[PDB]
Amino acid sequence: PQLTPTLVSLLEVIEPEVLYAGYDSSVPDSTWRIMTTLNMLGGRQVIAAVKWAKAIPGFRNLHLDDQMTLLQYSWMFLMAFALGWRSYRQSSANLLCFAPDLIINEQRMTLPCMYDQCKHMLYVSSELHRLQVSYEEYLCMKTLLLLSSVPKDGLKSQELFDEIRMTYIKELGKAIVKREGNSSQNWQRFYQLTKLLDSMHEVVENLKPYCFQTFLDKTMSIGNIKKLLFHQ
Amino acid sequence: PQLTPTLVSLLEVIEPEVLYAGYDSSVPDSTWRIMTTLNMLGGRQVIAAVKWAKAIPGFRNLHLDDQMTLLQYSWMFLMAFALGWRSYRQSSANLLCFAPDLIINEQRMTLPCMYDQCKHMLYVSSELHRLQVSYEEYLCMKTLLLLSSVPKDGLKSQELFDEIRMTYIKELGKAIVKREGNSSQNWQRFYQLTKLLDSMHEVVENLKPYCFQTFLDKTMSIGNIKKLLFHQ
Amino acid sequence: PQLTPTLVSLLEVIEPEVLYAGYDSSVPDSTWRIMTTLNMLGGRQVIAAVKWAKAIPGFRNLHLDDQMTLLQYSWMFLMAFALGWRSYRQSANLLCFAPDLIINEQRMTLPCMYDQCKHMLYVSSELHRLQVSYEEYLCMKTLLLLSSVPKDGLKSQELFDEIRMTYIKELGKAIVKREGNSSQNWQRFYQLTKLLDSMHEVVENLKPYCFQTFLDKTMSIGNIKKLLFHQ
Amino acid sequence: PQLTPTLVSLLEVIEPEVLYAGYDSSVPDSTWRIMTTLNMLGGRQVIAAVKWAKAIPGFRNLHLDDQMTLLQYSWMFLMAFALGWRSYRQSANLLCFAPDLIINEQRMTLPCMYDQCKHMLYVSSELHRLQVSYEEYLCMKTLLLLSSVPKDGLKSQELFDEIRMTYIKELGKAIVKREGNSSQNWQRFYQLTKLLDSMHEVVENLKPYCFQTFLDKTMSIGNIKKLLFHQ
Ligand SMILES: CC#C[C@]1(O)CC[C@H]2[C@@H]3CCC4=CC(=O)CCC4=C3[C@@H](c3ccc(N(C)C)cc3)C[C@@]21C
Ligand SMILES: CC#C[C@]1(O)CC[C@H]2[C@@H]3CCC4=CC(=O)CCC4=C3[C@@H](c3ccc(N(C)C)cc3)C[C@@]21C
Ligand SMILES: CC#C[C@]1(O)CC[C@H]2[C@@H]3CCC4=CC(=O)CCC4=C3[C@@H](c3ccc(N(C)C)cc3)C[C@@]21C
Ligand SMILES: CC#C[C@]1(O)CC[C@H]2[C@@H]3CCC4=CC(=O)CCC4=C3[C@@H](c3ccc(N(C)C)cc3)C[C@@]21C
C-alpha cells in the first residue's frame, strides 16, 4: 500500500515535527509573557514553513519570485490552519494548542485581550470537528492554502502554478474518496472542505490587525492581491 | 590566568556561535531576497539574544517583567552592535557581515533601497575600526547595551539593576586597563567607548523605521522610555 | 513531472543533508585526530540512518525487531556507499567524509590511512566507472539496507520480501531512464547489482579497522544470510 | 553574588542541558530496544562531553593530544557520574538515563539489566548518602575528567598539574559552603574524594558490558596511571 506513493504520502513525509514554545509553566500566566512567546514561536514556524514549501512537489519549479510571493501571502493561512489541526487533535474542548507546552484553554482566554484574538482561531478547530477532517484531507488542504492568493497581475510561472493547484485539488478529491462514502456524499464533502478553505481568507483578515498590534508594541516598543476562491 | 575567572571570561563562554543566513549565492542578488533573508535571520538572532541574556550573571535575578522589558527595548542595539563587530573583524572595507554566507559589500549596497539602511549600520563598524576595540571591551559593551534603556517610571528590580549595570561598567574599565596604556589614556578611552554606546541610541532610532517598513511590506503584505546615557 | 510521485522521488525527499565533521583545518593533521573525528561523525551518521530508514515506505510496517536487525547489519554498507557517492560527486580519487574533512593525497600518507581508505576508494571508483545516476544511487542505497537477514529469517519475512522486490523493480525503472535499449538495460542491472554484492567484501574488510579503533580510542585497551543478487 | 564569578559558577553555566533518549513508551519494553537506545544516547553524550570539556577553563591550554587523551580515558567516568546525579535528583533507586528513559523496578527485571544497573545505582546511592550539593557535584565531575593520565605523563604535564590542583581547591570551596566546622570540612573532603576514587572500580565493571554491546549490536559478531586521592 505505502509501496505505491501518492502526492499525499509525500506531503506526509515532509510534514515537520511540532515545535515546543519553551514556556515556563512554573510561573504565573500573563498576557505579556504568552504573546511574547507566541511571537518567537510564530517566527520559528515561518522558518519551518519555508523549508516545508521547498519540499512540496512542483513548488521549486515555480520562479523564485513566485515562491517568495506565495509564502509571503499565505504564511498566516498555514499557521492558523495548522494550529486548528493541532487543537482539533488535542481535545474536543475549546482550546488552542499553540505548542504541546503552551495550550490556551478557556481559563487562559480570560486573560486580558486574549479572547478577541482566539475566537477567530477557534473557528478553524470548530470547523475541523464539525467535518471530522482526516489527516490526508488536512495535508492536501494545507498545501492548497499555500496556493490560495496570487498577485492581481498574475505570477511569473502562472501556467505552471495553475497546473500545480489543479493537481492538489485533485489530490484532495482522492483523500475524500478514501473515506469510503458514496459519490453523492463525496461531492457534498468537497463543497464543505473547500468552503472551509475559502473562509480562511476571512480568518486571516481578522487576525492580521492583532499581529500588527503586537509587532508595534513588543517589537518596536511603540487590492493588488487576488484571492483564489472555490465558491463565489 | 583563565583559572581565575572574571565577569568578562563568563561573557566570553556564553557568547553564541555565529548563525548562517542560508542565502543561495548561485542565484542573482535582489533586494527582495536579501531583505526576506535578513528578516528571518533577524528573528533567529532575537531567539539567540534571549538565551544569551538569561545566562548573563545578574539578569535572571531581575523580576521577570524587567527581563522581558530590557530585551524588548534593547534587541536592536544588540543586533546592530554585534553586526558592527562581525563586520569589523571580517575586513577593513565598508561592508556588513550579516552572516558568513551573506556579506553586503559596496557592490550589493548599490541595489535599490539598500544603502540608506546600511549607512547607519556602517557607522558602528567604522567606530570600531577607529577605536581598535578588543574582544573583551566588546563583550562588556554589548552587555551594557542590554542595560541601555529603562521605563520612565523605573524597573521593578530597579535597585538590583543599578548594581548590575554599575558592575558591568566597572568590568569595561578593567577590559580597558588590559590594553596596558597609561592612566590618562585609559581615562580618555573610557570616554570614547561609552560615547559610542551613547550613539547607539541614534543608530537604532534611524534603523527602526526600516524594520517597520519591511514588516509592513513582506510580512503583512501591506516617551515612556528613559535612555541611560553616559554623557549628557 | 514531480507531480506524479514515484518511490524514487520519495527517496529523494527523505535523503538527509550532508553532515559536517567539525574538523579544525588550522591545526596540523594527525591520524589520531582524523580517526577520532570520524568516530564521532560515524555515530552521528548512524542517527541519520535510523531516521532515514523509518521514513522508507514499507520499513515501518516491518516488525520493530526486524527494523532494528536490518539497521544493525547494514549501517556500514549504507555509510561506505554514501561516502563513495559523495566522493564520486565531489572530483578525483579523494574520500569526501564531509565537506570539511576530505582525505587528500597528502593525508593518505598518514599512518594506517591508506590501508583503510583503499577499500572505500574502490566504491567511489566503481560508481565513477559505471556512471551511476542519482536515482540509481538512491535505489541502490535502499537495497543495501535490505542486503542481509538472519539465517532463521525475519519476523515479517513475507513483507520484507515484497518490500525488497519492489525496490529491485524501482532500480530497474531508474536504469530504464538512461535511454538504452532493453538488452543494455538488462546488462546494466547486472553491473549495478554486482557492485551491490561486492559491498559485502568492502564491509568485511572495513569492520576490523572499526573494531580496532573502538578498542584503541574508546575502551583505551555466521547466523546471517547475505542476500546476493548473483551466486 | 553571581556578579563575583568563581570557577564553579563558570562550571554551572557550561553544564549542558539533559538530552532525551527518543524512546517510544507506547511500545512493549525490550532489553534489546533499551540497549540500542542507550548506545545512541551514549554517542550523543560523548559529543556533549567534548564540547563541555573545551569550555573548561584551562583545558584548551593543554596540548591537543592531552585534551584527546583525557577525554578518551574519562568519558565513562563522566557519563556514569552524571547519570548518578540525574538519578539522585529525580527520587528513589531508579536510573534516570533521560527524562523519557527511566529504568524503573519493572524494567530492572529484564535480562542483563540489573547486572549492569547495579554498578550505576551505587553511584546514585552514594551521592544520596553523602548529600552532595550541586556545586560539589560540578567540581567533582571536572575532577573525573582529570582522573587518569598516561604512565609516561602528558605533554602539558606541568599545566595539567596546576589545573587539577585548582579544581581540587575549588571542591574545597564548595565543601566550605555547607557551613560545617573546619574539622568536618576536612573530613567531608575525604568522603567526597573517596567516592571519586571509587569511580575507577565502577568504570572497570561497566567497560565489559559496553564492549559486549558493541560486539553484539554494532559489529553483529596498563600504560595508564590512575590519579587516586587516597592510596
Ligand atoms: C493568541 C494570539 C495571537 C495572534 O496575535 C493572532 C494570530 C496569531 C498567529 C497565528 C497563529 C499562530 C500559530 C502558532 O502556532 C504560533 C503563533 C501564532 C500566531 C502568533 C504570531 C506572532 C508573530 C508572528 N510573526 C510576525 C511572524 C507570527 C505569528 C500570534 C498571533 C499573531
Ligand atoms: C539591510 C537591512 C536592514 C534593516 O531593515 C535595518 C536594520 C536591520 C536589522 C538590524 C541589524 C541586523 C543584524 C543581523 O545580523 C540580522 C539582520 C538585522 C536586521 C534585520 C532585521 C529584520 C527583522 C527583524 N525582526 C522584526 C525581529 C530583526 C532584524 C533587517 C534590518 C531591520
Ligand atoms: C578512514 C577510516 C576508517 C574506518 O576505520 C574504516 C571504515 C570507516 C567507517 C565507514 C565509512 C564512514 C563514512 C562516513 O562518512 C563517516 C565515517 C565512516 C566510518 C568511520 C566510523 C567509525 C565508527 C563508527 N561507529 C562505531 C558507529 C562508524 C563509522 C571510520 C571507519 C570505521
Ligand atoms: C544499562 C546499561 C549499560 C551499559 O552497557 C553499561 C554502562 C553504560 C554507559 C554508561 C552510563 C550511561 C549514561 C547515559 O546517560 C547514557 C548511556 C550510558 C551508557 C551506555 C553507553 C553505550 C555506548 C557508548 N559508546 C560506546 C560511546 C556510551 C555509553 C550503555 C552502558 C555501556
PDB file of N, CA and C and ligand atoms in Angstrom, chain A residues 35 38-39 41-43 45-46 75 79 83 86 98 114 117-118 121 207 210-211, chain B residues 215 219, ligand 1:
ATOM      1  N   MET A  35       2.087  36.326  24.799  1.00  0.00           N
ATOM      2  CA  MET A  35       2.203  36.955  23.494  1.00  0.00           C
ATOM      3  C   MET A  35       3.654  37.059  23.057  1.00  0.00           C
ATOM      4  N   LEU A  38       4.531  33.597  21.913  1.00  0.00           N
ATOM      5  CA  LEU A  38       3.902  33.293  20.631  1.00  0.00           C
ATOM      6  C   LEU A  38       4.571  34.036  19.477  1.00  0.00           C
ATOM      7  N   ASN A  39       5.095  35.243  19.716  1.00  0.00           N
ATOM      8  CA  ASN A  39       5.774  35.951  18.633  1.00  0.00           C
ATOM      9  C   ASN A  39       7.041  35.225  18.219  1.00  0.00           C
ATOM     10  N   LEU A  41       7.609  31.986  18.815  1.00  0.00           N
ATOM     11  CA  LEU A  41       7.174  30.738  18.198  1.00  0.00           C
ATOM     12  C   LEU A  41       6.689  30.973  16.767  1.00  0.00           C
ATOM     13  N   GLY A  42       5.953  32.066  16.540  1.00  0.00           N
ATOM     14  CA  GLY A  42       5.498  32.374  15.192  1.00  0.00           C
ATOM     15  C   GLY A  42       6.639  32.514  14.201  1.00  0.00           C
ATOM     16  N   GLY A  43       7.712  33.201  14.599  1.00  0.00           N
ATOM     17  CA  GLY A  43       8.858  33.329  13.714  1.00  0.00           C
ATOM     18  C   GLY A  43       9.503  31.995  13.386  1.00  0.00           C
ATOM     19  N   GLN A  45       7.956  29.094  13.337  1.00  0.00           N
ATOM     20  CA  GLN A  45       7.060  28.359  12.440  1.00  0.00           C
ATOM     21  C   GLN A  45       7.133  28.893  11.003  1.00  0.00           C
ATOM     22  N   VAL A  46       7.401  30.187  10.823  1.00  0.00           N
ATOM     23  CA  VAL A  46       7.612  30.695   9.464  1.00  0.00           C
ATOM     24  C   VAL A  46       8.831  30.029   8.831  1.00  0.00           C
ATOM     25  N   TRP A  75       1.501  32.707   4.704  1.00  0.00           N
ATOM     26  CA  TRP A  75       2.058  32.129   5.936  1.00  0.00           C
ATOM     27  C   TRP A  75       1.047  32.101   7.085  1.00  0.00           C
ATOM     28  N   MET A  79      -0.348  28.860   9.215  1.00  0.00           N
ATOM     29  CA  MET A  79      -0.136  28.836  10.655  1.00  0.00           C
ATOM     30  C   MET A  79      -1.452  28.646  11.399  1.00  0.00           C
ATOM     31  N   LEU A  83      -2.575  25.324  13.367  1.00  0.00           N
ATOM     32  CA  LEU A  83      -2.985  25.473  14.761  1.00  0.00           C
ATOM     33  C   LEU A  83      -4.354  24.839  14.984  1.00  0.00           C
ATOM     34  N   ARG A  86      -3.832  21.085  15.187  1.00  0.00           N
ATOM     35  CA  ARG A  86      -3.280  20.612  16.458  1.00  0.00           C
ATOM     36  C   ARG A  86      -4.311  20.716  17.579  1.00  0.00           C
ATOM     37  N   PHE A  98      -1.170  25.846  20.727  1.00  0.00           N
ATOM     38  CA  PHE A  98      -0.056  26.500  20.035  1.00  0.00           C
ATOM     39  C   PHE A  98       1.173  25.598  19.998  1.00  0.00           C
ATOM     40  N   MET A 114      -7.028  38.398  25.329  1.00  0.00           N
ATOM     41  CA  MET A 114      -6.789  37.102  24.697  1.00  0.00           C
ATOM     42  C   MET A 114      -7.977  36.608  23.882  1.00  0.00           C
ATOM     43  N   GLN A 117      -8.737  37.743  20.091  1.00  0.00           N
ATOM     44  CA  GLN A 117      -7.857  37.091  19.130  1.00  0.00           C
ATOM     45  C   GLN A 117      -8.264  35.641  18.926  1.00  0.00           C
ATOM     46  N   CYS A 118      -8.446  34.918  20.028  1.00  0.00           N
ATOM     47  CA  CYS A 118      -8.578  33.470  19.971  1.00  0.00           C
ATOM     48  C   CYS A 118      -9.879  33.033  19.312  1.00  0.00           C
ATOM     49  N   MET A 121      -9.411  32.064  15.782  1.00  0.00           N
ATOM     50  CA  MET A 121      -8.655  30.831  15.606  1.00  0.00           C
ATOM     51  C   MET A 121      -9.449  29.610  16.045  1.00  0.00           C
ATOM     52  N   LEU A 207      -7.200  38.280  11.820  1.00  0.00           N
ATOM     53  CA  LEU A 207      -6.066  38.093  12.718  1.00  0.00           C
ATOM     54  C   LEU A 207      -4.923  39.064  12.432  1.00  0.00           C
ATOM     55  N   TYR A 210      -4.152  42.017  14.805  1.00  0.00           N
ATOM     56  CA  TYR A 210      -3.555  41.683  16.094  1.00  0.00           C
ATOM     57  C   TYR A 210      -2.064  41.392  15.953  1.00  0.00           C
ATOM     58  N   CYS A 211      -1.669  40.737  14.864  1.00  0.00           N
ATOM     59  CA  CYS A 211      -0.250  40.554  14.571  1.00  0.00           C
ATOM     60  C   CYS A 211       0.453  41.900  14.433  1.00  0.00           C
TER      61      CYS A 211
ATOM     62  N   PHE B 215       8.527  44.955   7.722  1.00  0.00           N
ATOM     63  CA  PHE B 215       7.436  44.188   8.322  1.00  0.00           C
ATOM     64  C   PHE B 215       6.123  44.424   7.588  1.00  0.00           C
ATOM     65  N   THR B 219       5.892  40.990   5.556  1.00  0.00           N
ATOM     66  CA  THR B 219       5.174  40.138   6.497  1.00  0.00           C
ATOM     67  C   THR B 219       3.669  40.346   6.416  1.00  0.00           C
TER      68      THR B 219
HETATM   69  C1  LIG E   1      -3.026  34.470  20.826  1.00  0.00           C
HETATM   70  C2  LIG E   1      -2.646  35.149  19.587  1.00  0.00           C
HETATM   71  C3  LIG E   1      -2.362  35.728  18.570  1.00  0.00           C
HETATM   72  C4  LIG E   1      -2.059  36.471  17.340  1.00  0.00           C
HETATM   73  O1  LIG E   1      -1.746  37.832  17.686  1.00  0.00           O
HETATM   74  C5  LIG E   1      -3.245  36.361  16.311  1.00  0.00           C
HETATM   75  C6  LIG E   1      -2.901  35.180  15.368  1.00  0.00           C
HETATM   76  C7  LIG E   1      -1.553  34.657  15.904  1.00  0.00           C
HETATM   77  C8  LIG E   1      -0.611  33.957  14.927  1.00  0.00           C
HETATM   78  C9  LIG E   1      -1.281  32.904  14.035  1.00  0.00           C
HETATM   79  C10 LIG E   1      -1.441  31.556  14.723  1.00  0.00           C
HETATM   80  C11 LIG E   1      -0.179  31.083  15.394  1.00  0.00           C
HETATM   81  C12 LIG E   1       0.108  29.767  15.470  1.00  0.00           C
HETATM   82  C13 LIG E   1       1.283  29.226  16.143  1.00  0.00           C
HETATM   83  O2  LIG E   1       1.357  28.051  16.457  1.00  0.00           O
HETATM   84  C14 LIG E   1       2.360  30.233  16.515  1.00  0.00           C
HETATM   85  C15 LIG E   1       1.776  31.575  16.932  1.00  0.00           C
HETATM   86  C16 LIG E   1       0.692  32.099  16.009  1.00  0.00           C
HETATM   87  C17 LIG E   1       0.480  33.410  15.831  1.00  0.00           C
HETATM   88  C18 LIG E   1       1.304  34.445  16.592  1.00  0.00           C
HETATM   89  C19 LIG E   1       2.353  35.112  15.702  1.00  0.00           C
HETATM   90  C20 LIG E   1       3.046  36.251  16.146  1.00  0.00           C
HETATM   91  C21 LIG E   1       4.003  36.870  15.348  1.00  0.00           C
HETATM   92  C22 LIG E   1       4.327  36.369  14.064  1.00  0.00           C
HETATM   93  N1  LIG E   1       5.280  36.961  13.231  1.00  0.00           N
HETATM   94  C23 LIG E   1       5.174  38.395  12.992  1.00  0.00           C
HETATM   95  C24 LIG E   1       5.774  36.169  12.107  1.00  0.00           C
HETATM   96  C25 LIG E   1       3.623  35.228  13.630  1.00  0.00           C
HETATM   97  C26 LIG E   1       2.663  34.625  14.436  1.00  0.00           C
HETATM   98  C27 LIG E   1       0.354  35.411  17.376  1.00  0.00           C
HETATM   99  C28 LIG E   1      -0.857  35.877  16.543  1.00  0.00           C
HETATM  100  C29 LIG E   1      -0.432  36.948  15.517  1.00  0.00           C
END
